[PDB]
Design a protein around this ligand. Structure first.
Ligand SMILES: Nc1nc2c(ncn2[C@@H]2O[C@H](COP(=O)(O)OP(=O)(O)O)[C@@H](O)[C@H]2O)c(=O)[nH]1
Ligand SMILES: Nc1nc2c(ncn2[C@@H]2O[C@H](COP(=O)(O)OP(=O)(O)O)[C@@H](O)[C@H]2O)c(=O)[nH]1
Ligand SMILES: O=c1[nH]cnc2c1ncn2[C@@H]1O[C@H](COP(=O)(O)O)[C@@H](O)[C@H]1O
Ligand SMILES: O=c1[nH]cnc2c1ncn2[C@@H]1O[C@H](COP(=O)(O)O)[C@@H](O)[C@H]1O
Ligand SMILES: O=CN(O)CC(=O)O
Ligand SMILES: O=CN(O)CC(=O)O
Ligand SMILES: [Mg+2]
Ligand SMILES: [Mg+2]
Lengths: 431, 431
């Protein structure tokens, strides 16, 4: 299909960057539709690694036009830092990146609040990346926040900013008792690159409509994952944007009817950074082992990730909400050397009931116990293999079982961090 | 198509209620996916009128199951008041209405803040319905708000509430200097109907997935209109939810790929309540005349609506964002007796440039001047007519011209407030 969505079927970190980078080879555009610099992906081409956060994972490809859509809360300081790093490396960012005047601006006071609020929560802390995403999203809905388009009239920008900062400082010092974020600093910092951001402005919605009418390969790229959806994830242990496929049309302007195929990045086992329900969470040697072989540490905060088994019950939630077309199974290689592998098939509720459906809010995950099927592991190295014939039957049955339990075929399989250590059984674009 | 979306192509108030009521005759379900009690629709069957706000417009139809989805910020006091009124009239609401534990709860302090913030804005006031939608949406994204599911554990609910109210009162009195909203009052009011709301809980996302697999006619119902979209409307003079088709999947749980047809309710002329850019706004006899024959007064605040000509440039924005399939032209009858009728075809920008594309943020609408095509009106009464043969050629050309300028066919036409004063040239369900 012409319009292909790529997102996280678990709790982010399942492998989006590598995949969008791999698949954008035929794309004209690439779009980020939600999130901000809370994201973090490691792309790896012939060993050379690239860590992105705010910038779409098609930015290294010349033939592609990256675009950060209105859904995204954009941080001026952040883009700039990622910009120089890629330019210093031969990737002419400003020449290939487009943005939307409607993106909300993440400014210092936003980090100041996120840290404050996260502090106040004490032990019930969310475990946020610490980037100011929540508050930026807050001012967005409150209709008090500033967006890229605001930079068109600098005088006016400064007026708005002065009072938004007026509003936010009163709380910071009087309520949380933290230090105030100085207005001039913020005004100066921002004005120093206002001209850069604004140059990058394009009417995104009308552009996708234009690209759609011509049949241009557009790939939409998600951040975080499904269970982090502000509406459908483990509330309140979630991010503040609709990480689910519904965020595509809202944060881009493309009418929902034009979503062709939805690719769900499915990690071979599970991970999660931040507080929150995690049924299949492993605290044993295997947990330790997964974190190890999977080099499981946040690409944004460097925090160790919580590890556990693949959860089919949870994955099945991801299927229905995103209207999945297929799965891209990643990190199958990390399970190498495991005597046996389990996949959560059902939940045992605190009241003795057996279920195949996930609770909604986090408190409703409290009792919940995972019921599994324990399949045999495999001694063979699957790393870098690029053909199924190179996959031992154990690994094949594990894959097949996954499909059976979900009703969704594994269209691509990743066996290593490098773009090429991959096998595409069907390109989301060829249907 | 099985899944049909019905929404506002302008600024809300174009005729959604009557239409959803008319079309739900073949639907199993009806879903509200965003907004709250800010909405207000007048349904009219054989002269008897019904004014709804929070409850979906299929609630009067026995064979239909109404559902207010997670996208909707739900107000306990509000539902209850609308409930009794329909029950007192023979419509067993609790028997036909379903809700979602994930809906955020609008409570008093939310109205208290909305009034406060709206006050502070002085002359740059948004002109909100005054129902607390903004703040409710604010706490939602901030991850501090309460949802329906919270009512499962009353003890806990009371703990959360006490501190959310703790947080909100500090601002109300110390910052805005307004009176505090008392905690016990709120706790008591809510607990009095906790049992009613919760009884109505269903896993909405999984239910639509279930209905989808069986091919059940589902109609999604929007509130407000497109230019009121928090991301794509005339920011900040907008509502706080994605009124656009993208709000469907986000506020329901249905995967975006299952949207079949999108019906856009297109009023014959334009109206708008609240501050905000309005290119074709009429301040003359015609403006007065439209407001008159169109009985143009908010069904929620009773405020007079701003009137003006149909704006094709703006409507064309609605087309691309919602991925319209067709238009339901409403209120053609009000134009009866008009010597001539104009339709905005292009915008003249403050810099001499002619354009067919709408600015995004409200400040970018400042210069903007409408360029029109002035067609002839018609003496004939079109009221209640239910066949095109009963429509004078003037009216026909006006319709045809509309289609030409947009690329979207008018599938239904409404010639009066009563469900039956309507003509369906194509039922969104039969394709
Ligand atoms: N061993 C292994 N590493 C992988 C594979 N796919 C990706 N990686 C690396 O594994 C990680 C996925 O992490 P992260 O980038 O946070 O994912 P993202 O946020 O979805 O893009 C990064 O460290 C990638 O380089 C894989 O298939 N096998
Ligand atoms: N004359 C006339 N009145 C109509 C027509 N369609 C609906 N109405 C009435 O016009 C109004 C549309 O207003 P409102 O209900 O706010 O629309 P909503 O918010 O989209 O549902 C209500 O007063 C309806 O009863 C129509 O085709 N002609
Ligand atoms: O890209 C991401 N990967 C993994 N977790 C994330 C990501 N973005 C946010 N989170 C988590 O979602 C929650 C809120 O983060 P925020 O986006 O920083 O508000 C915390 O658990 C974060 O660790
Ligand atoms: O259903 C509606 N019809 C018309 N205008 C609405 C509706 N809901 C909200 N608005 C307008 O959208 C803006 C914000 O309203 P709020 O939903 O009350 O925040 C104001 O202009 C409101 O008048
Ligand atoms: O890629 C994003 N990280 O893993 C999340 C974080 O570091 O918080
Ligand atoms: O139907 C809703 N109204 O017309 C909006 C309002 O009264 O503010
Ligand atoms: Mg990551
Ligand atoms: Mg209305």
């Amino acid at each position: 299909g012409n319009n292909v969505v790529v997102l996280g079927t678990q709790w982010g970190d399942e492998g989006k960057g590598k995949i969008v980078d791999l698949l954008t080879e035929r794309a004209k555009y690439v779009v980020r539709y939600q999130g901000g610099h809370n994201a973090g992906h490691t792309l790896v081409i012939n060993g050379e690694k690239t860590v992105l956060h705010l910038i779409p994972s098609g930015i290294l490809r010349e033939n592609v036009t990256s675009i950060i859509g209105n859904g995204v809360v954009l941080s001026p300081a952040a883009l700039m830092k990622e910009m120089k790093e890629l330019e210093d490396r031969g990737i002419p960012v400003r020449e290939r990146l487009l943005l939307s005047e409607a993106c909300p601006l993440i400014l210092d006071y936003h980090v100041a609040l996120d840290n404050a609020r996260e502090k106040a929560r004490g032990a019930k802390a969310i475990g946020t990346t610490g980037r100011g995403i929540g508050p930026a999203y807050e001012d967005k809905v409150a209709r008090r926040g500033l967006r890229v388009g605001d930079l068109f009239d600098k005088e006016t920008f400064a007026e708005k900013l002065k009072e938004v900062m007026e509003y936010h400082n009163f709380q910071l010092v009087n309520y949380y008792k933290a230090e105030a974020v100085d207005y001039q600093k913020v005004l100066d910092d921002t004005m120093a690159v206002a001209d850069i951001l604004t140059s990058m402005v394009v009417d995104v919605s009308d552009l996708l409509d234009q690209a759609r009418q011509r049949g241009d390969f557009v790939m939409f790229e998600g951040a975080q994952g499904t269970l982090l959806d502000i509406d459908h994830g483990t509330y309140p242990y979630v991010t503040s944007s609709n990480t689910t496929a519904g965020g595509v049309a809202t944060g881009s302007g493309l009418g929902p009817r034009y979503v062709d195929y939805v690719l769900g990045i499915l990690k071979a086992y599970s991970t999660r950074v931040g507080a929150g329900p995690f049924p299949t969470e492993l605290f044993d040697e295997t947990g330790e082992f997964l974190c190890k072989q999977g080099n499981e540490f946040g690409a944004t905060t460097g925090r160790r990730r919580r590890t556990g088994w693949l959860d089919t019950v949870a994955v099945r939630r991801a299927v229905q909400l995103n209207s999945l077309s297929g799965f891209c199974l990643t990190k199958l290689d990390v399970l190498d050397g495991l005597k046996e592998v389990k996949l959560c098939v059902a939940y045992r509720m605190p009241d003795g009931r057996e279920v195949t459906t996930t609770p909604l809010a986090a408190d409703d995950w409290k009792g919940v116990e995972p019921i599994y099927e324990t399949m045999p592991g495999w001694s063979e190295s699957t790393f870098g293999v690029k053909d199924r014939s190179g996959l031992p039957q154990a690994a094949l049955n594990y894959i097949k079982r996954i499909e059976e339990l979900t009703g969704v075929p594994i269209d691509i399989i990743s066996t290593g961090p490098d773009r090429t250590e991959t096998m595409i059984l069907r390109d989301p674009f060829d249907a």
